[PDB]
């Protein structure tokens, strides 16, 4: 089976420089139950007045360091 | 100075992989920037005056130029 994804955050409004929790519900991705699967962060799009970027290694120059993902 | 794991706790031997750099275990930063000594080939910037940042520190008597120079283990 295939299902459509649900993307959500902890809260609507964020102060600049604060940490946001970003959650992705894609059952398509639990390929192995025994292990925790890792997926590239370039899947998500950031588009705003400032710039449009993928928030990963494939984003605009210095965008990856500008988000400081934990984990990668 | 020829490796991406400079002035960090880890190994000179390293590789570039998805999660990041394989030879890096711990590092220390001021204002979210790596605390490193001004050495190598890219330390020739003088800033406002004609003094490079490396000699600029030396005139202030500072020997703790970065994490690698404090002898931190």
* Cβ-defined contact of A68 to B20 (cutoff 8 Å): no
3-state DSSP assignment of residue A53: strand
Residues 17 through 56 of chain A touching chain B, CB cutoff 8 Å: 38, 40
- Chain A nearest CA to B18, separation (Å): 8
Experimental method: cryo-EM
A9 φ, ψ (degrees, to nearest 5): -130, 170
Ordered alpha helix ranges (H), chain A: 63-67
CB-count burial class (<10 Å; 0-12, 13-18, 19+) for A6: exposed
- Radius of gyration of chain A, Cα coordinates, nearest whole angstrom: 14
Resolution number, Å:
2.9
3-state DSSP assignment of residue A71: coil
Residues near A53 by beta carbon (within 8 Å), at least 6 away in sequence = A45, A46, A47, A59, A60, A63
């Amino acid at each position: 089976d295939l299902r459509n994804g649900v993307l959500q955050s902890d809260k609507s409004v964020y102060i600049i420089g604060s940490d946001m929790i970003l959650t992705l519900i894609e059952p398509d991705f639990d390929l192995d139950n025994d292990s925790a699967e890792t997926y590239d962060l370039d899947l998500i799009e950031w588009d705003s007045d400032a710039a449009t970027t993928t928030m990963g290694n494939k984003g605009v120059t210095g965008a990856a360091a500008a988000f400081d993902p934990e984990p990668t | 100075n020829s490796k991406a794991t400079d002035d960090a706790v880890g190994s000179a031997t390293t590789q570039s992989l998805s999660f990041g750099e394989l030879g890096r275990l711990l590092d220390v930063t001021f204002d979210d920037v790596i605390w490193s000594t001004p050495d190598g080939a890219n330390n020739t910037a003088t800033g406002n005056d004609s003094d490079t940042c490396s000699t600029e520190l030396s005139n202030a008597g500072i020997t703790d130029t970065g994490l690698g120079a404090t002898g931190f283990t």
